[PDB]
Scaffold this active site. Structure first.
Site, PDB file in Angstrom:
ATOM      1  N   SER C  64       6.768  85.985  32.107  1.00  0.00           N
ATOM      2  CA  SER C  64       7.985  85.459  31.508  1.00  0.00           C
ATOM      3  C   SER C  64       8.782  84.693  32.553  1.00  0.00           C
ATOM      4  CB  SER C  64       8.827  86.591  30.917  1.00  0.00           C
ATOM      5  OG  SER C  64      10.055  86.106  30.396  1.00  0.00           O
ATOM      6  N   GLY C  65       9.219  83.493  32.186  1.00  0.00           N
ATOM      7  CA  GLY C  65       9.838  82.598  33.137  1.00  0.00           C
ATOM      8  C   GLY C  65       8.885  81.660  33.841  1.00  0.00           C
ATOM      9  N   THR C  69       7.519  80.602  26.926  1.00  0.00           N
ATOM     10  CA  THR C  69       8.347  80.244  25.782  1.00  0.00           C
ATOM     11  C   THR C  69       8.119  78.796  25.375  1.00  0.00           C
ATOM     12  OG1 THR C  69      10.273  79.410  26.966  1.00  0.00           O
ATOM     13  CG2 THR C  69       9.990  81.794  26.850  1.00  0.00           C
ATOM     14  N   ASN C 106      10.107  89.908  37.955  1.00  0.00           N
ATOM     15  CA  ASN C 106      10.794  89.010  37.037  1.00  0.00           C
ATOM     16  C   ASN C 106      12.098  89.631  36.568  1.00  0.00           C
ATOM     17  OD1 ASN C 106      11.603  87.138  35.161  1.00  0.00           O
ATOM     18  ND2 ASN C 106      10.047  87.686  33.648  1.00  0.00           N
ATOM     19  N   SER C 109      11.657  89.912  32.173  1.00  0.00           N
ATOM     20  CA  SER C 109      10.329  90.347  31.766  1.00  0.00           C
ATOM     21  C   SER C 109      10.343  90.893  30.348  1.00  0.00           C
ATOM     22  CB  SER C 109       9.822  91.419  32.720  1.00  0.00           C
ATOM     23  OG  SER C 109      10.864  92.338  32.986  1.00  0.00           O
ATOM     24  N   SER C 110       9.300  90.571  29.595  1.00  0.00           N
ATOM     25  CA  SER C 110       9.131  91.103  28.254  1.00  0.00           C
ATOM     26  C   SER C 110       8.378  92.423  28.319  1.00  0.00           C
ATOM     27  CB  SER C 110       8.375  90.113  27.368  1.00  0.00           C
ATOM     28  OG  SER C 110       7.068  89.884  27.864  1.00  0.00           O
ATOM     29  N   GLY C 332       1.690  91.559  31.559  1.00  0.00           N
ATOM     30  CA  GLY C 332       0.613  91.203  32.454  1.00  0.00           C
ATOM     31  C   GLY C 332       0.077  92.387  33.243  1.00  0.00           C
ATOM     32  N   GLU C 334       0.242  94.016  35.793  1.00  0.00           N
ATOM     33  CA  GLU C 334       1.148  94.079  36.925  1.00  0.00           C
ATOM     34  C   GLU C 334       0.644  95.045  37.985  1.00  0.00           C
ATOM     35  OE1 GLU C 334       4.904  95.266  35.434  1.00  0.00           O
ATOM     36  OE2 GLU C 334       4.080  96.569  33.875  1.00  0.00           O
TER      37      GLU C 334
END
Ligand SMILES: Nc1ncnc2c1ncn2[C@@H]1O[C@H](COP(=O)(O)OP(=O)(O)O)[C@@H](O)[C@H]1O
Lengths: 56, 371, 530, 56
Positions: C64-65, C69, C106, C109-110, C332, C334
């Site tokens: 995310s980022g 999106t 992040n 983060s989602s 992800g 991670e």
């Protein structure tokens, strides 16, 4: 002509039966509650005397 | 696949599924047969009623208990009890459910052997296992040490466990229990004028006991209080009206647990057998045993039992110790709760007894490592 | 292009590659020849759908980022072009609030697995869009690490720019005040949280649901926040829990629409059903605290799922909806230096996904070979990774041992570690000792995944995996005077898999959800975006 | 005829009203005993902690 008298008596009878049922319900409820509360207070009171002799 | 936990007990069958929080089916372990003749043709009535149904037709039937003191005496109606449990209360086919059953310590071996023979041949369960009741009670209580007093309806026993190791030489078993208390209450009500003789009136007396009896903290002082006051009398309503009132008998009944000489036994009270089972254990673990005294089973449900037993064991033990009596509110189901926990363990799924294991080793395989 | 993938490094400046001319002019060119771009795979998925009469799946994979999106935005633009995106982007800030939290890698983060289903008609024309949420992590609502925060919403509400919310929710400005949150990072230079609160309120007011409903949402979140400060003590000479502090109890009940004494009684003394009767169960402080945490996680996740249902109802169009092409947004693989239970769950999910793609590519290579008439090497490419899955889900695997351990009476983290080792060390293939490098913090054991050797930490897993839901308080919620009674509408013979309220574990619920997500994906021909 | 059953229903209705009266009296006394026991147990459950800290 007395049939209206009979019916009115039936109605007041039904009302009184419902009243009696509700009163019995509340009576048994409160009685269970009072007995349980007395059990608890007697138990914990005996415990208080035990911790009192403990303190002594 | 899921396992069934059947705590057949002696006086109540508790069944359910492993992984639940409470037993699903709880009914008396009773088989009733009609003793009158039966006149209405077309009634089509059956020959024997089982379980909770037999208590509705209690006035027509003569009620048998298939389990006397832990031990199973009648085997045909015990198969009836199990059949009713599997098919009418749980509605499960036992050909695809492992079954966990419980048993009291120090029982005959033929009890276990026939139990597993039946569970494998009559019901064809894929696996089965027989567990001790006190161990399951400890599982459910959440301890791993502690001396457990499991007073059921046929048998009372102490099983001291430390750190997960049971000390078998210190296991005590006593044949005084709820049914003996019911019989003493039947015999003691007679002096007040009430007579209960039928096996159908024994159930009424059991109900009176459950709903009105309690353990006195000081027996002599309570006897004096009853001999002087009247604030102890309570009234009970028989099935046909006819209110009855009892005084002394309220606490004279469960006092048999602390003075078994009331019913003519020679042994010592539950407090004294608990203390003796502790003193049989090694000197290093008596601290934890004193501090973790766990109660379970139906006969431990009287109000005041825990306070009385703590007072007694405290007056017995040395003054330095902390005596604690662990008595949960869901006490009378602790064996079943622990059984569900146990059968729900992934570590347990290799300790069942399989079908082929039994077929190759005979019923004697119950006492071996697959316990 | 990288075989069956489509890799995309985000450019940081505008390019003419997103002009509608290339969009319209690609129509009529093939995948094998045209240079790589996501419009290619989008059209290939479309035509695959239209020829095979099946659904397709787009698996956009990134942080995310890093442009996810806007990548999905240009995807949905291209799909509209080849024939409701504004509504998607408009309702997006709601999900960004209710499902994003600051991690270390992040700040936005989602956590939940967003997944948009784009349906179509018989004529392959735009019909409607559907959305589902998966694998939303509940542990965040209660426990936060040393370096990370809770979800954004609590902080956005903690922005005083709406003093009416604070003075109607009894929320003091001080974020250290609330224990569920204060253990994480209090505040960070992530975003303008006040402005984000405003953007979410705007998105709410322009979404189908009323102002009272936003009010109830905010107050419910404040009640979740008020759960954390409850205080319980053991009784006099017993093992029973009783409350000493009652003020937060009173205010949380006044918010939730229940009675305070009644909620306290339902927490200290649950009632369970034994056959045809109810008997009261006993609780101590640890048990009541675990129950409170599970209740909070449950109500939060419930409100979240229902909010997503409301979003989908707003989006819903009556046009007939035929085969769809879904796009999936997931966490992800991670890695850190203090991996924990949540990271293990994430990596387990990504393991299932990677094994799925690997088997997919295996069948694709078998297709290439059966086309070319040259057929050799008939071993599949999935089992080599499944062998690592069997160390998490299978009985006597890590998750089963964890469940058993949080069921056992006096289990501790050292005992958990001992059982893991006794039951896997050496006897397995991927489970192995930890490694201590450059003075890392700590590691208790190490698994190997496709993405490398990962060292995991045990401390806290038992306490954080417990999810004992309290049935009496759930019934209280069903009997509320709010919208809460809809969220908790109904939640907890002949063959019953009813696991008890106490035999509940985050890991088990997660395994079930992952199973059903795999069952939803494995019916669609997939496509992957990196 | 209807008179016997009518007056019999009347008598049992009055007697059931008497049952209502006595049941309500029992309700009042039950409320009293419950509330008094509650006050006592309040005193006792607040001072038990002081006793336990004394012995501590
Ligand atoms: N509230 C109670 N007070 C006293 N005795 C009880 C109570 N409830 C049950 N019992 C006694 O417990 C016995 C049943 O105990 P239980 O735990 O069912 O043992 P089992 O399962 O072996 O029958 C019954 O005989 C009954 O008399």
């Amino acid at each position: 002509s007395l049939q209206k008298k009979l019916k009115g008596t039936e109605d007041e009878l039904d009302k009184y039966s419902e009243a009696l049922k509700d009163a019995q319900e509340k009576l048994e409820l409160a009685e269970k509650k009072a007995t349980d509360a007395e059990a608890d207070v007697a138990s914990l009171n005996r415990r208080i005397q035990l911790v009192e002799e403990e303190l002594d | 696949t899921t396992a069934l936990v059947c705590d057949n007990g002696s006086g109540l069958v508790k069944a359910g599924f492993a992984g639940d929080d409470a037993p699903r089916a709880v009914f008396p372990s009773i088989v009733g047969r009609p003793r009158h003749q039966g006149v209405m043709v077309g009634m089509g009535q059956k020959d024997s009623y089982v379980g909770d149904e037999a208590q509705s037709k209690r006035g027509i039937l003569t009620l048998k208990y298939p389990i006397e003191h832990g031990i199973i005496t009648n085997w045909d109606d015990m198969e009836k009890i199990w059949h009713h449990t599997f098919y009418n209360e749980l509605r499960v086919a036992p050909e695809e459910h492992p079954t966990l059953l419980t048993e009291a310590p120090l029982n005959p071996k033929a009890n276990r052997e026939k139990m597993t023979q039946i569970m494998f041949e009559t019901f064809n369960v894929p696996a089965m296992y027989v567990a001790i009741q006190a161990v399951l009670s400890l599982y459910a209580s959440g301890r791993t040490t502690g001396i457990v007093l499991d007073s059921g309806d046929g048998v009372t026993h102490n099983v001291p466990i430390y750190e997960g190791y049971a000390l078998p030489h210190a296991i005590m078993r006593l044949d005084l229990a709820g049914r003996d208390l019911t019989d003493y209450l039947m015999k003691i009500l007679t002096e007040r004028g009430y007579s209960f003789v039928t096996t159908a009136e024994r159930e009424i007396v059991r109900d009176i006991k459950e709903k009105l009896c309690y353990v006195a903290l000081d027996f002599e002082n309570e006897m004096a209080t009853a001999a002087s006051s009247s604030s102890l009398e309570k009234s009970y309503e028989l099935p046909d009206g006819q209110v009855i009132t009892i005084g002394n008998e309220r606490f004279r009944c469960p006092e048999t647990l602390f003075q078994p000489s009331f019913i003519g036994m020679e042994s010592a009270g539950i407090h004294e057998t608990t203390y003796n089972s502790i003193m049989k254990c090694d000197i290093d673990i008596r601290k934890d045993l004193y501090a973790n005294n766990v109660l379970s089973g139906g006969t431990t449900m009287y109000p005041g039992i825990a306070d009385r037993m703590q007072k007694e064991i405290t007056a017995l033990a040395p003054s330095t110790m902390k005596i604690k009596i662990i008595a949960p509110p869901e006490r009378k189901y602790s064996v079943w709760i622990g059984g569900s926990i146990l059968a729900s363990l992934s570590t347990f799924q290799q300790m069942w007894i399989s079908k082929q294991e039994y077929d190759e080793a005979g019923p004697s395989i119950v006492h071996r490592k697959c316990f | 292009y990288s075989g069956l993938f489509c890799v995309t490094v985000n450019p940081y400046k505008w390019l003419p590659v997103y002009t509608p001319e290339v969009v319209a002019a690609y129509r009529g060119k093939k995948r094998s020849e045209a240079p790589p771009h996501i419009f290619s795979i989008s059209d290939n998925a479309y035509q695959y759908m239209l020829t095979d009469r099946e659904n397709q799946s787009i698996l956009i994979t990134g942080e995310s980022g890093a442009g996810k999106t806007v990548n999905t935005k240009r995807v949905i633009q291209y799909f509209a072009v080849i024939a409701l995106e504004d509504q998607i982007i408009q309702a997006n800030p709601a999900l960004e609030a209710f499902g994003n939290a600051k991690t270390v890698r992040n700040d936005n983060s989602s956590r939940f697995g967003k997944f948009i289903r784009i349906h179509f008609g018989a004529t392959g024309k735009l019909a409607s869009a559907d959305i589902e949420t998966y694998l939303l992590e509940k542990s965040r609502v209660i426990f936060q690490l040393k370096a990370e925060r809770d979800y954004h919403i609590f902080y956005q509400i903690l922005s005083n720019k709406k003093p009416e919310l604070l003075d109607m929710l009894l929320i003091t400005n001080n974020p250290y005040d609330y224990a569920f949150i204060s253990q994480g990072e209090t505040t960070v230079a992530s975003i303008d949280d006040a402005e984000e609160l405003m953007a979410t309120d705007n998105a709410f007011d322009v979404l189908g649901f009323t102002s009272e409903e936003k009010n109830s949402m905010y107050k419910l979140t404040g009640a979740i926040m008020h759960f954390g400060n409850m205080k319980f003590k053991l009784k006099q000479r017993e093992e029973q829990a009783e409350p000493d502090g009652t003020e937060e109890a009173d205010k949380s009940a006044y918010l939730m629409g229940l009675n305070s004494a009644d909620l306290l009684k339902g927490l200290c003394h649950p009632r369970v059903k034994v056959g045809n009767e109810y008997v009261t169960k006993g609780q101590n402080v640890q048990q009541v605290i675990y129950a409170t945490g599970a209740l909070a996680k449950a109500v939060y996740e419930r409100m979240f799922n229902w909010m997503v249902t409301r979003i989908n109802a707003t989006l819903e169009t009556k046009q007939p909806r035929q085969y769809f092409i879904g796009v999936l947004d997931i966490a992800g693989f991670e890695i850190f230096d203090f991996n924990s239970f949540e990271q293990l769950c994430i990596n387990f999910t990504n393991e299932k996904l990677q094994q799925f793609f690997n088997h997919h590519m295996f069948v694709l290579e078998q297709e290439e070979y059966k086309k070319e008439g040259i057929e050799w090497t008939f071993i599949d490419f999935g089992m080599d990774l499944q062998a690592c899955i069997d160390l998490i889900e299978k009985p006597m695997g890590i998750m089963s041992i964890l469940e058993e351990e949080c069921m056992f009476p006096k289990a501790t983290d050292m005992t958990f570690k001992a059982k893991l080792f006794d039951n896997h060390l050496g006897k397995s293939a991927n489970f192995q000792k930890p490694r201590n490098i450059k003075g890392k913090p700590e590691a208790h054991f190490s698994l190997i995944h496709y993405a490398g050797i990962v060292d995991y930490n045990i401390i806290g897993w038992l306490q954080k995996n417990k999810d004992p839901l309290n049935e009496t308080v759930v019934g209280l919620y069903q009997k509320s005077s709010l919208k809460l009674l809809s969220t908790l509408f109904a939640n907890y013979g002949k063959g019953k898999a009813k696991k008890g309220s106490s035999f509940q574990t985050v890991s088990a619920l997660h395994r079930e959800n992952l199973n059903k997500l795999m069952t939803n994906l494995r019916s669609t021909h997939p496509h992957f975006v990196r």
